[PDB]
Amino acid sequence: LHKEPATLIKAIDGDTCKLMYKGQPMTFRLLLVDTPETKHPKKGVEKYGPEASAFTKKMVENAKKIEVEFDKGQRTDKYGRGLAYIYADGKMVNEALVRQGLAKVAYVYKPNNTHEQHLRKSEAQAKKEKLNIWS
Ligand SMILES: Cc1cn([C@H]2C[C@H](OP(=O)(O)O)[C@@H](COP(=O)(O)O)O2)c(=O)[nH]c1=O
Ligand SMILES: [Ca+2]
């Protein structure tokens, strides 16, 4: 895996954002995780959804540097969203959210799962501490 620079364009929710990547604006969806819905009517505003959005927004807007790290499989999902691990000043947003109990490890599709065990150990810790989603 290799990290590449990106420039924040707009934070959308806990797990989706818009970034300028390789010269063009693209919406990215965080790999291996799922923050609660705050948009789609079929799910409604789920608990911790607004919390997850806020955590992400703060984290990416206050960063000096943002980097995207694609995994080894497909780089986009069916909606044309970039699939990656996003780092804010060297800290992985995907893991950060899981650690706070603001996201669950989900959508584990091989071979896009390099950081699965890392994120899982952080989720176990959040559960163990009964944080947010786990309370
Ligand atoms: C994170 C991720 C999401 N997705 C898909 C699965 C879901 O499709 P469906 O929309 O058919 O359920 C949707 C979940 O994203 P959201 O959490 O943004 O909804 O995006 C992938 O294709 N691969 C992934 O790695
Ligand atoms: Ca989501």
Side-chain angles (χ1 to χ4, degrees):
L1 305 201
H2 173 261
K3 296 192 218 312
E4 299 180 67
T7 309
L8 201 238
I9 287 184
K10 191 170 73 68
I12 306 164
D13 66 335
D15 62 20
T16 307
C17 69
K18 213 143 183 194
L19 309 174
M20 187 61 85
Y21 172 68
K22 265 50 199 175
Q24 82 292 339
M26 253 198 91
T27 120
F28 277 80
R29 173 62 170 74
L30 300 183
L31 274 175
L32 306 177
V33 305
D34 187 44
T35 54
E37 187 62 56
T38 56
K39 247 59 69 181
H40 206 293
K42 187 253 297 186
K43 286 197 173 186
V45 178
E46 305 188 296
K47 237 291 80 179
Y48 300 111
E51 283 64 50
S53 289
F55 189 89
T56 301
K57 187 176 180 296
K58 299 304 106 61
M59 189 169 169
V60 309
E61 289 186 350
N62 295 143
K64 309 180 302 185
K65 304 176 175 183
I66 288 182
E67 299 173 292
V68 305
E69 175 178 72
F70 293 102
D71 210 325
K72 53 207 187 298
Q74 42 270 98
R75 288 164 163 47
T76 55
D77 65 2
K78 54 176 152 62
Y79 304 99
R81 296 183 300 183
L83 296 174
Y85 296 112
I86 297 173
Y87 298 83
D89 287 321
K91 311 173 204 65
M92 203 202 287
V93 183
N94 315 47
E95 189 279 332
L97 287 161
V98 178
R99 180 59 181 104
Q100 294 298 311
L102 289 177
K104 298 122 292 187
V105 168
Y107 306 114
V108 184
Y109 305 128
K110 289 163 175 289
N112 273 357
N113 58 349
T114 300
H115 299 319
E116 180 183 9
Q117 296 315 136
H118 172 59
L119 301 177
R120 282 184 188 296
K121 65 135 188 51
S122 294
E123 180 184 57
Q125 191 51 53
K127 275 143 62 200
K128 206 161 299 180
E129 299 171 6
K130 312 285 182 296
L131 290 179
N132 296 286
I133 277 172
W134 309 116
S135 57

mmCIF file of all heavy atoms in Angstrom, residues 89-112:
data_model
loop_
_atom_site.group_PDB
_atom_site.id
_atom_site.type_symbol
_atom_site.label_atom_id
_atom_site.label_comp_id
_atom_site.label_asym_id
_atom_site.label_seq_id
_atom_site.Cartn_x
_atom_site.Cartn_y
_atom_site.Cartn_z
ATOM 1 N N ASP A 89 -3.061 13.842 8.951
ATOM 2 C CA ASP A 89 -1.813 14.069 9.674
ATOM 3 C C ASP A 89 -1.255 12.753 10.206
ATOM 4 O O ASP A 89 -0.888 12.618 11.376
ATOM 5 C CB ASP A 89 -1.995 15.104 10.780
ATOM 6 C CG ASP A 89 -2.124 16.507 10.226
ATOM 7 O OD1 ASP A 89 -1.395 16.821 9.258
ATOM 8 O OD2 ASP A 89 -2.959 17.284 10.738
ATOM 9 N N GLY A 90 -1.227 11.774 9.309
ATOM 10 C CA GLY A 90 -0.704 10.471 9.632
ATOM 11 C C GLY A 90 -1.593 9.579 10.456
ATOM 12 O O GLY A 90 -1.195 8.455 10.742
ATOM 13 N N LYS A 91 -2.770 10.049 10.850
ATOM 14 C CA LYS A 91 -3.667 9.213 11.640
ATOM 15 C C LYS A 91 -4.815 8.690 10.774
ATOM 16 O O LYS A 91 -5.483 9.463 10.081
ATOM 17 C CB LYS A 91 -4.170 9.987 12.854
ATOM 18 C CG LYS A 91 -3.024 10.654 13.611
ATOM 19 C CD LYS A 91 -3.510 11.577 14.724
ATOM 20 C CE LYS A 91 -2.457 12.642 15.062
ATOM 21 N NZ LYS A 91 -2.211 13.584 13.927
ATOM 22 N N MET A 92 -5.023 7.371 10.782
ATOM 23 C CA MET A 92 -6.067 6.780 9.956
ATOM 24 C C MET A 92 -7.470 7.062 10.461
ATOM 25 O O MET A 92 -7.867 6.574 11.516
ATOM 26 C CB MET A 92 -5.873 5.280 9.831
ATOM 27 C CG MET A 92 -6.535 4.688 8.595
ATOM 28 S SD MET A 92 -6.845 2.922 8.774
ATOM 29 C CE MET A 92 -5.168 2.230 8.629
ATOM 30 N N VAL A 93 -8.238 7.810 9.678
ATOM 31 C CA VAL A 93 -9.606 8.144 10.048
ATOM 32 C C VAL A 93 -10.465 6.899 10.271
ATOM 33 O O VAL A 93 -11.258 6.862 11.213
ATOM 34 C CB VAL A 93 -10.271 9.038 8.970
ATOM 35 C CG1 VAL A 93 -11.686 9.435 9.403
ATOM 36 C CG2 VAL A 93 -9.423 10.294 8.724
ATOM 37 N N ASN A 94 -10.283 5.877 9.428
ATOM 38 C CA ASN A 94 -11.064 4.638 9.520
ATOM 39 C C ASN A 94 -10.939 4.026 10.914
ATOM 40 O O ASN A 94 -11.940 3.666 11.537
ATOM 41 C CB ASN A 94 -10.605 3.581 8.498
ATOM 42 C CG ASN A 94 -10.370 4.139 7.117
ATOM 43 O OD1 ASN A 94 -9.717 5.166 6.955
ATOM 44 N ND2 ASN A 94 -10.845 3.427 6.098
ATOM 45 N N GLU A 95 -9.700 3.899 11.385
ATOM 46 C CA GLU A 95 -9.409 3.328 12.700
ATOM 47 C C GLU A 95 -9.896 4.249 13.826
ATOM 48 O O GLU A 95 -10.527 3.799 14.782
ATOM 49 C CB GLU A 95 -7.905 3.022 12.808
ATOM 50 C CG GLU A 95 -7.475 2.228 14.047
ATOM 51 C CD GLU A 95 -7.322 3.106 15.289
ATOM 52 O OE1 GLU A 95 -7.026 4.316 15.142
ATOM 53 O OE2 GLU A 95 -7.513 2.599 16.415
ATOM 54 N N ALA A 96 -9.629 5.544 13.687
ATOM 55 C CA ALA A 96 -10.058 6.549 14.661
ATOM 56 C C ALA A 96 -11.543 6.383 15.001
ATOM 57 O O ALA A 96 -11.908 6.321 16.174
ATOM 58 C CB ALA A 96 -9.798 7.967 14.117
ATOM 59 N N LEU A 97 -12.390 6.301 13.976
ATOM 60 C CA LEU A 97 -13.836 6.149 14.161
ATOM 61 C C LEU A 97 -14.196 4.854 14.882
ATOM 62 O O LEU A 97 -15.054 4.828 15.771
ATOM 63 C CB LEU A 97 -14.560 6.196 12.802
ATOM 64 C CG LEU A 97 -14.721 7.519 12.031
ATOM 65 C CD1 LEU A 97 -15.036 7.233 10.565
ATOM 66 C CD2 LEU A 97 -15.810 8.377 12.661
ATOM 67 N N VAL A 98 -13.569 3.767 14.469
ATOM 68 C CA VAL A 98 -13.838 2.478 15.078
ATOM 69 C C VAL A 98 -13.433 2.526 16.549
ATOM 70 O O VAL A 98 -14.194 2.085 17.411
ATOM 71 C CB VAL A 98 -13.092 1.316 14.325
ATOM 72 C CG1 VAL A 98 -13.349 -0.001 15.005
ATOM 73 C CG2 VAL A 98 -13.576 1.213 12.901
ATOM 74 N N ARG A 99 -12.272 3.116 16.837
ATOM 75 C CA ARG A 99 -11.773 3.206 18.210
ATOM 76 C C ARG A 99 -12.724 3.930 19.167
ATOM 77 O O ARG A 99 -12.785 3.602 20.353
ATOM 78 C CB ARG A 99 -10.391 3.861 18.247
ATOM 79 C CG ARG A 99 -9.799 4.000 19.653
ATOM 80 C CD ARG A 99 -9.657 2.636 20.328
ATOM 81 N NE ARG A 99 -9.107 2.706 21.688
ATOM 82 C CZ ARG A 99 -9.819 2.568 22.808
ATOM 83 N NH1 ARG A 99 -11.134 2.355 22.762
ATOM 84 N NH2 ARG A 99 -9.207 2.618 23.981
ATOM 85 N N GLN A 100 -13.451 4.918 18.650
ATOM 86 C CA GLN A 100 -14.415 5.693 19.446
ATOM 87 C C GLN A 100 -15.809 5.060 19.495
ATOM 88 O O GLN A 100 -16.707 5.595 20.130
ATOM 89 C CB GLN A 100 -14.570 7.115 18.880
ATOM 90 C CG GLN A 100 -13.340 7.970 18.977
ATOM 91 C CD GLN A 100 -12.917 8.207 20.409
ATOM 92 O OE1 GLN A 100 -13.727 8.578 21.252
ATOM 93 N NE2 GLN A 100 -11.646 7.983 20.693
ATOM 94 N N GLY A 101 -16.004 3.941 18.808
ATOM 95 C CA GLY A 101 -17.318 3.333 18.804
ATOM 96 C C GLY A 101 -18.281 4.148 17.958
ATOM 97 O O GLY A 101 -19.471 4.230 18.266
ATOM 98 N N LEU A 102 -17.762 4.784 16.907
ATOM 99 C CA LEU A 102 -18.586 5.585 15.999
ATOM 100 C C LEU A 102 -18.782 4.929 14.626
ATOM 101 O O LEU A 102 -19.418 5.490 13.739
ATOM 102 C CB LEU A 102 -17.992 6.979 15.838
ATOM 103 C CG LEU A 102 -18.139 7.850 17.081
ATOM 104 C CD1 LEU A 102 -17.452 9.175 16.849
ATOM 105 C CD2 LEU A 102 -19.617 8.050 17.395
ATOM 106 N N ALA A 103 -18.241 3.729 14.470
ATOM 107 C CA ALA A 103 -18.348 2.976 13.230
ATOM 108 C C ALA A 103 -18.122 1.513 13.557
ATOM 109 O O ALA A 103 -17.519 1.180 14.579
ATOM 110 C CB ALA A 103 -17.300 3.457 12.216
ATOM 111 N N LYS A 104 -18.652 0.642 12.709
ATOM 112 C CA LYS A 104 -18.497 -0.798 12.873
ATOM 113 C C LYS A 104 -17.640 -1.253 11.708
ATOM 114 O O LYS A 104 -17.614 -0.596 10.660
ATOM 115 C CB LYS A 104 -19.855 -1.507 12.769
ATOM 116 C CG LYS A 104 -20.865 -1.111 13.835
ATOM 117 C CD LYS A 104 -22.166 -0.545 13.233
ATOM 118 C CE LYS A 104 -21.968 0.821 12.539
ATOM 119 N NZ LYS A 104 -23.242 1.476 12.099
ATOM 120 N N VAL A 105 -16.886 -2.325 11.908
ATOM 121 C CA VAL A 105 -16.084 -2.885 10.832
ATOM 122 C C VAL A 105 -17.130 -3.582 9.948
ATOM 123 O O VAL A 105 -17.875 -4.450 10.425
ATOM 124 C CB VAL A 105 -15.059 -3.901 11.364
ATOM 125 C CG1 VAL A 105 -14.437 -4.695 10.216
ATOM 126 C CG2 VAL A 105 -13.991 -3.174 12.145
ATOM 127 N N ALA A 106 -17.220 -3.163 8.688
ATOM 128 C CA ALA A 106 -18.196 -3.715 7.761
ATOM 129 C C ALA A 106 -17.650 -3.740 6.352
ATOM 130 O O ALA A 106 -16.578 -3.212 6.083
ATOM 131 C CB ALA A 106 -19.463 -2.875 7.794
ATOM 132 N N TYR A 107 -18.415 -4.362 5.458
ATOM 133 C CA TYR A 107 -18.096 -4.472 4.033
ATOM 134 C C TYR A 107 -16.692 -4.980 3.772
ATOM 135 O O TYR A 107 -15.922 -4.376 3.008
ATOM 136 C CB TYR A 107 -18.316 -3.117 3.338
ATOM 137 C CG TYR A 107 -19.701 -2.535 3.557
ATOM 138 C CD1 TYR A 107 -19.875 -1.353 4.277
ATOM 139 C CD2 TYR A 107 -20.828 -3.157 3.031
ATOM 140 C CE1 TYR A 107 -21.137 -0.796 4.466
ATOM 141 C CE2 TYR A 107 -22.093 -2.612 3.213
ATOM 142 C CZ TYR A 107 -22.240 -1.431 3.927
ATOM 143 O OH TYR A 107 -23.486 -0.870 4.066
ATOM 144 N N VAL A 108 -16.361 -6.105 4.395
ATOM 145 C CA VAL A 108 -15.032 -6.674 4.229
ATOM 146 C C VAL A 108 -14.977 -7.528 2.964
ATOM 147 O O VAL A 108 -15.313 -8.711 2.980
ATOM 148 C CB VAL A 108 -14.589 -7.488 5.491
ATOM 149 C CG1 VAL A 108 -13.151 -7.979 5.330
ATOM 150 C CG2 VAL A 108 -14.703 -6.628 6.746
ATOM 151 N N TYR A 109 -14.601 -6.908 1.853
ATOM 152 C CA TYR A 109 -14.512 -7.629 0.595
ATOM 153 C C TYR A 109 -13.055 -7.866 0.271
ATOM 154 O O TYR A 109 -12.240 -6.947 0.316
ATOM 155 C CB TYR A 109 -15.167 -6.836 -0.537
ATOM 156 C CG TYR A 109 -16.604 -6.428 -0.277
ATOM 157 C CD1 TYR A 109 -17.008 -5.105 -0.433
ATOM 158 C CD2 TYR A 109 -17.566 -7.367 0.107
ATOM 159 C CE1 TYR A 109 -18.330 -4.722 -0.219
ATOM 160 C CE2 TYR A 109 -18.887 -6.992 0.327
ATOM 161 C CZ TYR A 109 -19.260 -5.667 0.159
ATOM 162 O OH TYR A 109 -20.566 -5.282 0.367
ATOM 163 N N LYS A 110 -12.708 -9.114 -0.003
ATOM 164 C CA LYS A 110 -11.338 -9.454 -0.354
ATOM 165 C C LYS A 110 -11.149 -9.074 -1.821
ATOM 166 O O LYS A 110 -12.118 -9.043 -2.582
ATOM 167 C CB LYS A 110 -11.107 -10.950 -0.145
ATOM 168 C CG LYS A 110 -11.076 -11.370 1.311
ATOM 169 C CD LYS A 110 -11.256 -12.875 1.437
ATOM 170 C CE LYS A 110 -11.104 -13.358 2.883
ATOM 171 N NZ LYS A 110 -9.695 -13.293 3.387
ATOM 172 N N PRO A 111 -9.920 -8.713 -2.224
ATOM 173 C CA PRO A 111 -8.705 -8.634 -1.410
ATOM 174 C C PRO A 111 -8.497 -7.246 -0.775
ATOM 175 O O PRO A 111 -7.370 -6.884 -0.422
ATOM 176 C CB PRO A 111 -7.619 -8.923 -2.430
ATOM 177 C CG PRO A 111 -8.113 -8.169 -3.622
ATOM 178 C CD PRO A 111 -9.602 -8.499 -3.651
ATOM 179 N N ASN A 112 -9.567 -6.458 -0.665
ATOM 180 C CA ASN A 112 -9.475 -5.128 -0.062
ATOM 181 C C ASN A 112 -9.633 -5.232 1.441
ATOM 182 O O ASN A 112 -10.575 -4.679 2.005
ATOM 183 C CB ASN A 112 -10.563 -4.206 -0.615
ATOM 184 C CG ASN A 112 -10.144 -3.515 -1.882
ATOM 185 O OD1 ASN A 112 -9.016 -3.677 -2.334
ATOM 186 N ND2 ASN A 112 -11.051 -2.748 -2.471
#
